[PDB]
């Protein structure tokens, strides 16, 4: 029931720079843990009892702190660095985790290539209709999904799905995907995405007209 | 080698229970406790408890209300987390963990376990439909296309997708799964190729669902 609130919920940053990562307790704890996760893996102890290193760390990891406030902090940062850190307290049961902060790559801004895809007539047959929209390739992650059928803003018909920051080029792509059924679907003419990004100067509109 | 090996993936109705295994190896069972955290799709870690293994003392997190039971054979090596009456929202991630002395001579070594996937819902086994995320016939002389296919209402995870037998991977992305309303997964998988050679080129998306042992082969191409 001690909370632990991490800050910030996202760290961006270069290979070779610093990272400083804070956790803050509701109430003041002893010492403070921190753990590594990578997507797929188990969390990884880094530091024990808020500055002693876990064997085999790497002595680029340093923590630190007192009372409410601990830090950990990266130095020279390798791409085998970048995960979500979680800080834990052991001092008051039960035991309780920080909600996490990503560290990710910083890199250029990267536009989005937006791609529109109407449903099939196979799926149409089966009574439903999906329309996706595709963002490839951008960064950073912010970016903004618009759907609009005959001019009608959608709210809540759709879900949006995110790739890992990848290991190549460090970019997201996203997929959203509006649910129509086939009644609604066919009582409709114009389906549109509007995709908004910093790598774009304007939003940029996908769109078809059904049966067209 | 110390090694944690967990028990394979679970699938649950709502009020069963469910029993993971946690078998360690490689040390001496009975000098360090073992604990259990779980992380539901997507979200953070919570602690469950912990467990003595030489005489069987426990601590839980009192959030489960007396749902998680842990219990050790020392026979085998080999500790058990039962969690009972089980809701959707116990559907998560579960591990075991080595636990640890921070007032030891040494560096402390860390051991998790892989893991093990309990799916609770009421949903049945289901085979995906899969459908063409068709590119726009719209050409170019040295522009480039997306194309996909849309692996829709199946159930549980997990599906695997490769394109052209796996010939086809670099700019593939294969999109991780929704949980839709209707408590079926749907996912995409997508790939970047020249919009010239649209109709001689042929990609076919190939997708796996063991667990209805459902394969599909899907050609997508223009439309019309």
């Known amino acids: 029931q001690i909370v632990l609130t991490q800050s910030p919920a996202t760290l961006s940053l270069s290979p070779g720079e610093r990272a400083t990562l804070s956790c803050s307790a509701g109430?003041?704890?002893?010492?403070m843990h921190w753990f590594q996760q990578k997507p797929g893996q188990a969390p990884r102890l880094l530091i024990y009892?808020?500055?002693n290193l876990a064997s085999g760390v790497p002595a680029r990891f340093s923590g630190s702190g007192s009372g409410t406030d601990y830090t950990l902090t990266i130095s020279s940062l390798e791409p085998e660095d970048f995960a979500v850190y979680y800080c834990?307290?052991?001092?008051?049961?039960?035991?309780?985790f920080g909600q996490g902060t990503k560290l990710e790559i910083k890199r250029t801004v990267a536009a989005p290539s937006v791609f529109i895809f109407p449903p099939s007539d196979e799926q149409l047959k089966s009574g439903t209709a999906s329309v996706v929209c595709l963002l490839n390739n951008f960064y950073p992650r912010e970016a903004k999904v618009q759907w609009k059928v005959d001019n009608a803003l959608q709210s809540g018909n759709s879900q949006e799905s995110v790739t890992e920051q990848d290991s190549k080029d460090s970019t997201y792509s996203l997929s959203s995907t509006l649910t129509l059924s086939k009644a609604d679907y066919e009582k409709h003419k114009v389906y549109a995405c509007e995709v908004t990004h910093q790598g774009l100067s304007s939003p940029v509109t996908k769109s078809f007209n059904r049966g067209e | 080698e110390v090694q944690l090996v967990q028990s394979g993936a679970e699938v649950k109705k709502p009020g069963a229970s469910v029993k993971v295994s946690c078998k360690a190896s490689?040390?001496?069972?009975?000098?360090?406790?073992i604990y259990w955290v779980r992380q539901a799709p997507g979200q953070g870690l919570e602690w469950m408890g912990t467990?003595?293994?030489?005489?069987?003392?426990?601590s839980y997190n009192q959030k489960f209300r007396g749902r998680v039971t842990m219990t050790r054979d020392t026979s085998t090596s080999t500790v058990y987390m039962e969690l009972s009456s089980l809701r959707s929202e116990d559907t998560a991630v579960y591990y075991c963990?080595?636990?640890?002395?921070?007032?030891?001579?040494?560096?402390?070594?860390?051991?998790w376990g892989q893991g093990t996937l309990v799916t609770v819902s009421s949903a049945s086994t289901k085979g995906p439909s899969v459908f063409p995320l068709a590119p726009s016939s719209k050409s170019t002389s040295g522009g480039t296309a997306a194309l996909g296919c849309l692996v829709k209402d199946y159930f549980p995870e997990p599906v695997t997708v490769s394109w052209n037998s796996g010939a086809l991977t670099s700019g593939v992305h294969t999109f991780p799964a929704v949980l839709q309303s209707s408590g079926l997964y749907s996912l995409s998988s997508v790939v970047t190729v020249p919009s010239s050679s649209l109709g001689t080129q042929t990609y076919i998306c190939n997708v796996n669902h063991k667990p209805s042992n459902t394969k599909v082969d899907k050609k997508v191409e223009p439309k019309s």
């Open positions: 963990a080595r636990d640890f002395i921070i007032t030891v001579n040494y560096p402390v070594v860390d051991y």
């Open positions: 467990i003595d293994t030489s005489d069987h003392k426990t």
């Open positions: 490689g040390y001496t069972f009975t000098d360090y406790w």
């Open positions: 109430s003041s704890v002893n010492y």
């Open positions: 834990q307290q052991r001092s008051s049961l039960p035991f309780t």
């Open positions: 009892s808020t500055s």
